[PDB]
Design an enzyme around this catalytic site. Structure first.
Site, PDB file in Angstrom:
ATOM      1  N   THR A   1       0.814  -1.200   0.000  1.00  0.00           N
ATOM      2  CA  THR A   1       0.000   0.000   0.000  1.00  0.00           C
ATOM      3  C   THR A   1       0.856   1.263   0.000  1.00  0.00           C
ATOM      4  O   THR A   1       1.988   1.272   0.494  1.00  0.00           O
ATOM      5  CB  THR A   1      -0.987   0.059   1.199  1.00  0.00           C
ATOM      6  OG1 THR A   1      -1.662   1.322   1.181  1.00  0.00           O
ATOM      7  CG2 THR A   1      -0.251  -0.099   2.536  1.00  0.00           C
ATOM      8  N   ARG A   2       0.315   2.305  -0.615  1.00  0.00           N
ATOM      9  CA  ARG A   2       0.955   3.614  -0.658  1.00  0.00           C
ATOM     10  C   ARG A   2      -0.152   4.618  -0.292  1.00  0.00           C
ATOM     11  O   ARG A   2      -0.030   5.796  -0.555  1.00  0.00           O
ATOM     12  CB  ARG A   2       1.500   3.906  -2.071  1.00  0.00           C
ATOM     13  CG  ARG A   2       0.594   3.393  -3.183  1.00  0.00           C
ATOM     14  CD  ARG A   2       0.960   4.009  -4.540  1.00  0.00           C
ATOM     15  NE  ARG A   2       0.286   5.286  -4.685  1.00  0.00           N
ATOM     16  CZ  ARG A   2      -0.913   5.444  -5.251  1.00  0.00           C
ATOM     17  NH1 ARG A   2      -1.557   4.408  -5.782  1.00  0.00           N
ATOM     18  NH2 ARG A   2      -1.448   6.652  -5.311  1.00  0.00           N
TER      19      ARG A   2
ATOM     20  N   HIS B   1      -8.400   2.083   5.132  1.00  0.00           N
ATOM     21  CA  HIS B   1      -9.725   2.298   5.687  1.00  0.00           C
ATOM     22  C   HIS B   1     -10.303   0.948   6.112  1.00  0.00           C
ATOM     23  O   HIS B   1      -9.632  -0.076   6.011  1.00  0.00           O
ATOM     24  CB  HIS B   1     -10.597   2.988   4.631  1.00  0.00           C
ATOM     25  CG  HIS B   1     -10.046   4.308   4.201  1.00  0.00           C
ATOM     26  ND1 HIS B   1      -9.853   5.347   5.082  1.00  0.00           N
ATOM     27  CD2 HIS B   1      -9.628   4.755   2.992  1.00  0.00           C
ATOM     28  CE1 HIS B   1      -9.337   6.382   4.436  1.00  0.00           C
ATOM     29  NE2 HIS B   1      -9.188   6.048   3.166  1.00  0.00           N
TER      30      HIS B   1
ATOM     31  N   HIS C   1      -9.903  -2.070   3.819  1.00  0.00           N
ATOM     32  CA  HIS C   1      -8.579  -2.704   3.721  1.00  0.00           C
ATOM     33  C   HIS C   1      -8.320  -3.624   4.911  1.00  0.00           C
ATOM     34  O   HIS C   1      -7.756  -4.704   4.763  1.00  0.00           O
ATOM     35  CB  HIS C   1      -7.488  -1.631   3.607  1.00  0.00           C
ATOM     36  CG  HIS C   1      -7.772  -0.610   2.555  1.00  0.00           C
ATOM     37  ND1 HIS C   1      -7.643  -0.869   1.204  1.00  0.00           N
ATOM     38  CD2 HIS C   1      -8.222   0.662   2.654  1.00  0.00           C
ATOM     39  CE1 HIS C   1      -7.998   0.205   0.518  1.00  0.00           C
ATOM     40  NE2 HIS C   1      -8.355   1.146   1.376  1.00  0.00           N
TER      41      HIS C   1
ATOM     42  N   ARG D   1      -6.340  -4.717  -7.878  1.00  0.00           N
ATOM     43  CA  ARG D   1      -6.936  -4.341  -9.159  1.00  0.00           C
ATOM     44  C   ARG D   1      -6.122  -3.114  -9.523  1.00  0.00           C
ATOM     45  O   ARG D   1      -5.957  -2.239  -8.681  1.00  0.00           O
ATOM     46  CB  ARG D   1      -8.405  -3.951  -8.971  1.00  0.00           C
ATOM     47  CG  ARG D   1      -9.090  -3.457 -10.251  1.00  0.00           C
ATOM     48  CD  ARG D   1     -10.447  -2.819  -9.919  1.00  0.00           C
ATOM     49  NE  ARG D   1     -11.141  -2.287 -11.093  1.00  0.00           N
ATOM     50  CZ  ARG D   1     -11.839  -3.023 -11.957  1.00  0.00           C
ATOM     51  NH1 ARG D   1     -11.958  -4.332 -11.775  1.00  0.00           N
ATOM     52  NH2 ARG D   1     -12.435  -2.448 -12.999  1.00  0.00           N
TER      53      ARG D   1
END
Ligand SMILES: [Ca+2]
Ligand SMILES: [Ca+2]
Ligand SMILES: [Ca+2]
Ligand SMILES: [Ca+2]
Ligand SMILES: [Ca+2]
Ligand SMILES: [Ca+2]
Ligand SMILES: [Mg+2]
Ligand SMILES: [Mg+2]
Ligand code: NA
Ligand code: NA
Ligand code: NA
Ligand code: NA
Lengths: 510, 510
Positions: A195-196, A200, A203, A289
């Site tokens: 992740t970058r 929330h 996730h 995705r």
């Protein structure tokens, strides 16, 4: 699993007994020194700590060419992103094979000694096309042409120390350290989450489900090196991750920061990510995705297809040696007070709720409510602090060149007027006199929430020094943010135009 | 600093290549097996992981005698608490020097193989006097006579595995692991804080001040093995520590759990604690007022003087090789909204506030407010959950032997009556029929907040099976908790006596 290529190339460990010796050599007066750029520091940290195993240096032309055209090192090892030391001609000219050069950080900290194998001028046109798909707007292509050096220096590295970081000493685990953290907990199945962005509720839910299905523990492995232009700063994000890791069941998850410089290179980057997580000790990896995708270009076309990443990774499944877990994004079901995989809902008429990035941004800008079903309140609080709403934002009003009224009087009138309003914003009439040392402070005052009144414009060739966020031009030109009816409009009328523009844009609330 | 004696005796590491071999031997049909008791498991974990360096086994009589009289191992190494393997005669008789025995946990998990050096029957009278000061009420003396075996088996240990723990896998760092955690953060000065209690605002303040003064990082190192009888359970305490470590400035503190079995042996224990923290990697240690003291005996006399610990440790300062930091307890200054060292206040007429253990206990019992200046609200919330107030507590009413009214009808009347009240408490008429398997469940129901109505008393020789907390005797005897006016008092009058007693004691609130 085993590191890519079979051996963890932890050069810090390999060269431990050569540290004093390499440090002395790096500090000798006769050795050539190259000061690493911010991206090169991210890359060298990953080579030196084995995160880029089997790499043990920056790619020479042989490996580089093979990576560009075949997605493999010359020996056939799968490797999709070229990692090279880009320098300018003036430096490349005083270099030759066998030359040993010192690589520094901040022109003061010796990081490594590179033994030059070759020096070459790559065809940046072919690299852009073959590796990043050719769109001049691709973050990597923009970097490749406008920032990167035109000469690449291939060579083997000997480690002195990893790039210095004073923040988060505890969370920046190297591959060897992370593997030991997993070993001490007897974790032999670990699924990594890339992740970058802020995380929330969705996730947290998707990662816990991934853990349940793969019978694995969770590794939240965010990128804190270079990410996509415009992303939330890593300090804010790390605060968000530290907060959210506390919402997992005790003992299920571990947070470690990855100092990677992403290229936002979609499918090829996804494959590179799988290899890196394998080097770091993960047994499983989630491919999203549009994984590592930079979005759409100016004409609205996708730089990558939404499933290109999952498909490229699937094509290499038999040689990656790390299991890829299917991406099952979830969404909130109000009527059922729970989250469910989006691929399992609707069709049977089921109400769902979601907040897009654009909407979240809007809410943070206006100070609007953000629901707990979407994001944990403690996370939202952090985001609001780092991205305060308009009544708490700074700004600048620039008195345009067209003005013929007294600039001193109009500035004074604006200051006195603004000081009447409550709120706590700090105000200042700011004279830059077209000096770079003053112009560069404009965004610092705006970032501190202050309101600046700038009596005259700076020269056009200085524009690049001043960011445009929250800077408003008061002028007669149609390009003005606050348009004057005429160059000599009465000061009191100008003041009202400015106050009402600021209120309309949310800076003042009455 | 260097481990005590110079070498970290991490036997798990030393014997890594002998694990399969030792495991097979431990499982052979001909080897003698001793199942470790709960305290022996705490001690063996510390010997095996090097926490008790220089120890490499349980003390033979030679070292033991020297520790008892001289506070040193036979070779002169400072060591104040005897760590021995206590067994009963039946086992000691089938043992002889050189015999190799397997030490198991839960009669199923092989922990180590002990090579017997000697078997002896120590004078528990002299041990109690010389090591624990002689008071029969001292927790260690009570343990030494009523629980410990009468025979000690001295011998060298070979490790198979450390005692199994399924909770907090991440926080139970061995000395080698903790030293690596400090090393990876470049922490070379670390001050350790010992505790077997919840941590309130005062403790957070005193540890941060200690860090400031010693220019050291903080190690919160709570005991989670055996502590003082009646202490808050380690699960509740660990939750409290995990919550409070978040209130320190980022990067200043580390939490690690110590599986030590305290002896509550004051000054000698304080010295032992200093040595253990040194083995674990700490450079500094805080020695408290009445450090490791079990309080006062029945006659109100102190088992130890309040400064005996600080003085004994000071006497060994030149050979401990770990710096002891002065204990500066702090107190809250309402009028100044801050905390200050108690040795620096008053005399100048300064208002201060504090909440004693007795008061805290009272507040938790009645559900009263506990101020944020005293303890962080998130910590208080945890304590309330583990120690709920009276309206949420369970209880038992036992129909005494004296009763001549129908026990079936009186039980039914009590149940129906209790079911009228709100609250959510679960009620049950509980027949134990003097069976241990049922009697032992009484405190389990009480612990779950339930109200039991027990129609008859159990036999006196079963008393030990039922804890006395919240168990009330309804009877005519003067010893009754709820005294009947007569053995045949009308059922409706008895019911009212019971309801009003329960209300008066807080179980019912109307
Ligand atoms: Ca160029
Ligand atoms: Ca699309
Ligand atoms: Ca005019
Ligand atoms: Ca005995
Ligand atoms: Ca006293
Ligand atoms: Ca009667
Ligand atoms: Mg670094
Ligand atoms: Mg253990
Ligand atoms: Na400099
Ligand atoms: Na495609
Ligand atoms: Na058993
Ligand atoms: Na004394």
């Amino acid at each position: 699993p085993a590191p890519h290529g079979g051996i963890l190339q932890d050069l810090i460990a390999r060269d431990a007994l050569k540290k004093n010796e390499l440090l002395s050599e790096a500090q000798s007066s006769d050795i050539l020194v190259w000061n690493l750029t911010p991206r090169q520091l991210c890359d060298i940290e990953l080579i030196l700590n084995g995160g880029f195993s089997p790499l043990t240096g920056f790619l020479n032309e042989n490996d580089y060419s093979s990576v560009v055209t075949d997605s493999r090192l010359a020996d056939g090892t799968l490797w999709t992103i070229p990692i090279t030391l880009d320098v300018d001609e003036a430096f490349a000219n005083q270099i030759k094979p066998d030359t040993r050069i010192a690589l520094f950080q901040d022109d003061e900290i010796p990081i490594a000694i590179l033994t030059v194998q070759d020096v070459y001028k790559p065809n940046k046109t072919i690299e852009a096309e073959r590796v990043f798909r050719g769109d001049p707007e691709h973050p990597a292509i923009s970097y490749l042409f406008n920032v990167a050096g035109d000469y690449y220096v291939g060579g083997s590295l000997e480690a002195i120390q990893l790039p210095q970081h004073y923040d988060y000493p505890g969370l920046r685990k190297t591959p060897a350290q992370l593997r030991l953290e997993f070993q001490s907990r007897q974790w032999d199945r670990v699924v990594a989450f890339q992740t970058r962005n802020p995380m929330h509720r969705a996730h947290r839910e998707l990662t816990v489900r991934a853990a349940r299905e793969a019978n694995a523990k969770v590794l939240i492995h965010p990128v804190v090196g270079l990410t996509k232009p415009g992303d939330i700063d890593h300090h804010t994000r790390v605060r968000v991750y530290q907060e959210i890791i506390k919402r997992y069941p005790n003992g299920i998850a571990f947070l470690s920061l990855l100092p990677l410089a992403m290229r936002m290179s979609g499918d090829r980057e996804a494959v590179w990510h799988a290899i890196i997580r394998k080097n770091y000790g993960a047994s499983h990896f989630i491919v999203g995705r549009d994984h590592a995708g930079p979005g759409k270009n100016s004409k609205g076309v996708d730089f990558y297809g939404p499933y290109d990443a999952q498909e490229l990774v699937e094509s290499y499944k038999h040689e990656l040696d790390i299991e890829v877990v299917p991406f099952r994004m979830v969404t909130y079901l109000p009527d059922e007070d729970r989250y469910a995989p989006i691929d399992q809902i609707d069709t049977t008429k089921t109400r769902t709720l979601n907040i897009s990035g654009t909407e979240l941004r809007r809410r943070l800008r206006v100070g609007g409510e953000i629901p707990e079903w979407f994001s944990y309140p403690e996370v939202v609080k952090i985001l609001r602090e780092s991205n305060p709403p308009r009544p708490k934002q700074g700004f600048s009003i620039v008195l345009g060149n067209s003005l013929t009224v007294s600039r001193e009087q109009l500035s004074i009138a604006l200051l006195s007027t603004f000081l009447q309003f409550g709120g706590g914003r700090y105000y200042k009439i700011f004279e830059h006199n077209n000096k770079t040392e003053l112009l560069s402070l404009i965004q610092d005052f705006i970032g501190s929430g202050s309101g600046l009144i700038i009596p005259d414009q700076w020269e056009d060739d200085k524009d690049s020094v001043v960011g445009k966020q929250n800077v408003y031009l008061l002028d007669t030109s149609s390009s003005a943010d606050i348009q004057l009816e005429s160059a000599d409009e009465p000061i009191s009328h100008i003041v009202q135009k400015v106050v009402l523009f600021l209120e309309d844009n949310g800076f003042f609330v009455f």
